[PDB]
């Protein structure tokens, strides 16, 4: 669940 | 009352207080006014946002917020409860208030809630209280805004925080619509551009988004961020944002390289750009930062010019670097002629490789050791590859008088780069 | 007495005093005895070795040397002047002696002169005084030995320091004869094996080298060194060195990862070895390491995760079982993608679960209480997770109906050499 | 040079  | 400076908003090892102090000092030296504390992996900012700072953490935060005010830099404290908060549960909201209060008493006046990079749904409990995801964030954000007594500067980072991230499009998003509508006018909205790392920020994009946001946004600028790629460093000028944006924005905060000392250019050229329209030439600001940076480091301005050109921008190499790439490509494409031209270019090329070697040896012999260290792995990498590229050009030239293949015998491990990760990369098309 | 421990001897950011101290705690706890200070890019160690320590630096070193004595770890100070020293010049020699004495009074008793990675010929002023390059290092080393009163431990790292570095071979190298014979019988010689990063150090090679240098060598082991590639980390067991090497060597000092916290396996397993199964020793080391990872305390990471982590960043010549396995599976799926008889998809499913475990491993590591460890390994673990998740999706792309700048410039040039993937 |  990160930058993209 | 326009906000311009740095957000520490990346993944990875955060900066230490001695870096953050040296940072403030530089910001004022260059007339920037703002700092957003939002390091993704300082666990009490995001991972364990519910938790209070311990005694020694308190002393440290206070000392830092001191230095901020001592240097007239506005300190904004961020908190990222997005991951696991229950919006409808009031004990949750209490925990968030108790946390922000604890920071209030450090000397902190400005605050930010960030909801970037989180799941787009909610839990069964929330689906009842709130008609949408958008409602839930807004409701809690406002509640806090007022609880803080409507503070000086207060930022909100939405989940759909850039063009790519708006569903199904930017100007037809239920989520962004309801934010525009319901988020209180004194709360500012954060935006990264049309992408997470924007190559260009068109004024039309800002206009289009301002109409849905019902206000001007502060840019979270990922122009110089290098946390998403181990090999990547960005020493290029601030670029692809018109000076004509300044009147149309509430601020720009740059999220820069993880390695503190690499951000000299990144921050300087942003300063120059802001101070030019409180056009602007990327090529020219770069010239300005490199000269003034050269003071801090033996090493020549040309070595810096090379270095910036090798690690320039997420979508662009620098002149001297793009040049070497073309030249190597031609040389490898037209190798099969081994006739007059080819060799002179190879000789010239092996020379440009020399300049990289020289840039490395002088940088290692330099007196500023902090700066060396932040960059050491990055420049050793390019030196290594350039020397293998010099070597390979040499070998191609020697083809007419030898049939030995390029690697001879048994290899040391750095003949074969990247480890497992590199192996999986070579298998993608 | 046999020397075993760590040398801080890599290029790049050296460890800070507080890390070294922690190293001393770990070496003692694991029953090791030695630390060789040789960080190539510490300022005063090599580039500007002539310069004396300030008052503040002085305070910092002796504090560190005291700690060494406090933990019964033998502290060896090394100095690398070979770069631009002139041998014949007395001012240079006094500068060397004076540098040494300054560290004596810091509480030091053991020393090293290192001449690795320097040009083979000298300045004209040295060309006549000494007949050969070898003769010339030997002379200055011996003199320094006696100058400090022939101390208990004194180490010399030769220029031809590994099998591959010897001209035209080890067993018949001019340079090595001169070291063997002219270097004082009580000084020790450092050796990395057949190569700079030795996959194996076979017994026969040690005999071949000891004959020609007339003594048993101290191994400077680069098995776990990771300074030479941004993308590379080595958390695998000490491997490729038979226990039968022990009778034949004065010591082993390992030159381990740049990122301090990553060297738990690398050092624990060397210890284990010193007291042998590489996989048994990994299991003991991973098991003890797990305890260093906690959840943080709250008023409002598993062993299989560590096993996975180590398999992915294992050793220079070898991937770990799980890593190789996922790489096999990914190969077969990409090859047999044409199918989309039955089997492939049953196997695509298991593979996305493996990818899952990589993402899982990163998530848990991200919540751990020991931030020192996280930070040290962050970019390494981040990378693997990104690539895996991309590999996961790409595998799906084949099942479904539906970064050109990755690595930047370096990446781009690298993709143009034919030797890229010459090892897959 | 370097270890090379
Ligand atoms: C998304 O990506 C950037 C660059 O990788 C990271 O630093 C940032 O924390 C994330 N969030 C936002 C709002 O950009
Ligand atoms: C040679 O290379 C290793 C790994 O790249 C480096 O750490 C070490 O300083 C150099 N010298 C010796 C004797 O290994």
Author numbering:
A (entry chain D), D (entry chain B): 393 to 396
B (entry chain C): 59 to 336, 373 to 391, 552 to 592, 604 to 694
C (entry chain A): 59 to 333, 374 to 398, 553 to 592, 604 to 665, 679 to 700
What does the publication say?
In the substrate complexes, all the glycopeptides were bound in the OGA substrate-binding cleft. Particularly, the GlcNAc moieties were anchored by the same set of OGA residues in the catalytic pocket, displaying nearly identical binding conformations regardless of the glycosylated residues or the flanking peptide sequences. Consistent with the O-GlcNAc hydrolysis mechanism, the catalytic residue D174 was optimally positioned to make a hydrogen bond with the N-acetyl group of GlcNAc in all the complexed structures. The N175 mutant side chain played an important role in anchoring the glycosylated hydroxyl of serine or threonine and stabilizing the OGA substrate complexes. Intriguingly, the peptide backbone of TAB1 also adopted a V shape, but it was stabilized by an intra-molecular hydrogen bond instead of the interactions with N175. However, the peptide residues of TAB1 oriented dramatically differently in human OGA from those in the bacterial homologs, suggesting that human OGA dimer employs a unique substrate-binding mode. If the peptide bears intra-molecular interactions, it would provide additional stabilization energy for maintaining its ordered binding conformation.
